[PDB]
Amino acid sequence: TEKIICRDVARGYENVPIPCVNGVDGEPCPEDYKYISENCETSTMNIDRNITHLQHCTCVDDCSSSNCLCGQLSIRCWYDKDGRLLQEFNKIEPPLIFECNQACSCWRNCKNRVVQSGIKVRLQLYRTAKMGWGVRALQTIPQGTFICEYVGELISDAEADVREDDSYLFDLDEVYCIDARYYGNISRFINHLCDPNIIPVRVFMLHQDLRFPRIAFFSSRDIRTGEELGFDYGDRFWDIKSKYFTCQCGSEKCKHSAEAIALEQ
């Protein structure tokens, strides 16, 4: 039986509920962490929040013209009229995206505000066969759609270095990390895929302190109903971890499986 074990792991903090189900085993809803919808701090990071340091636009239309200074910070605004990344978006080396902010003359519903508007797609936390908890789509999601943000505790590299559990760490290449082990959102449950269907993009919204980009996941292709979400964790993860477990993504493209490791040797 597939059991509904939490109606909403976000406790009403997201735009939509994110339920949890388990049809595999008796493991209950995960509660060894604190669900947070926005990045938190546990020591002073001194993020630059001075409103006069913001780059900002002078638009009073919907920010769809090429005169929008905010879009010009990434050559162009990369969102189409429905908030999706443009077909030609560089999915290998994404540019930094500067969304409109409180210093801009535009309205809060201009076309340069996708990530700040939050989760719209319907996601579900579920028990996988071989990779613990994972996150899947409850609906068809077109290419270039914003899925969720990678949220957690902002920490220094020095702090990352003394922590035991490094399995929920995202690198913001002083250098910083988001650690989602103790505090995080739905993204902490997203597994690694060697054939990923989401891509991380660095985004700026309410501040433009370049040390602390916010990490937004967008679909890299059309995603089918029921499909598990996954991003490429990267080489730093697997260089550390492959000595202890191998990739179970099951793809013919898999480059971190025991069979992939044996073939390289």
Ligand X SMILES: C[S@@+](CC[C@H](N)C(=O)[O-])C[C@H]1O[C@@H](n2cnc3c(N)ncnc32)[C@H](O)[C@@H]1O
Ligand Y SMILES: CCCCCCNc1nc(NC2CCN(C)CC2)c2cc(OC)c(OC)cc2n1
Pairing of strands 176-184, 169-172: antiparallel
Q: Establish if 115 lies at the interface with Zn ion (CB under 5 A).
A: no
Nearer to a copy of itself, 18 or 198 (CB): 18
Are 19 and 3 spatial neighbours (Cβ–Cβ below 8 Å)?
A: no
- Chosen residue from 42, 102, 167, 225 binding ligand X by CB under 6 A: 167
Site string for ligand X, 175-194 (x = CB under 6 A): -------------xx-xx--
Q: Is 6 labelled as part of a ligand binding site?
A: no
Q: Is 107 labelled as part of a ligand binding site?
A: no
Q: Establish if 36 lies at the interface with a copy of itself (CB under 8 A).
A: yes
CA 86 to CA 244: how far, in whole Å?
39
CB hemisphere CA count around 59 (13 angstroms)? 25
Q: Is 132 labelled as part of a ligand binding site?
A: yes
- Chosen residue from 9, 20, 36, 68 binding Zn ion by CB under 5 A: 68
DSSP state of 70: H
Q: Establish if 15 lies at the interface with a copy of itself (CB under 8 A).
A: no
Q: Is 53 labelled as part of a ligand binding site?
A: no
Rounded-to-10 torsion of CA 158, 92, 74, 38: -50
Give the residue among 144, 158, 157 at the shortest CA–CA distance from 220.
144
Nearer to ligand X, 71 or 134 (CB): 134
Contact positions vs Cl ion (CB under 5 A):
46
